[PDB]
Structure 1
């Protein structure tokens, strides 16, 4: 795309390892840091996709 093909997403942050041959579709927020993450998505919160 001339601007960018924003149709593909890749997961970056996961809790732990991954077994062979499974899928992990989960539209969540990464509960990092001490403060309870509430979909803030700012610092200490991360959108895994």
Structure 2
């Protein structure tokens, strides 16, 4: 679900689509909550940190 204002929760539980549950693995339609995030010198002004 979406975060409440001024509310935050952090967990490593794998998000599982309702129609394609995994229940024990990062399978199809199952995504880890965290995704990489970085920057490079070649990035444009809108892409700079």
The structure carrying a bigger strand percent of its residues is 2
TM-score range, shorter chain: 0.3 to 0.5
- The TM-score normalised by the length of structure 1 is 0.47
| Larger RCO, structure (CA 8 Å, separation 6 or more) | 1
- The TM-score normalised by the length of structure 2 is 0.47
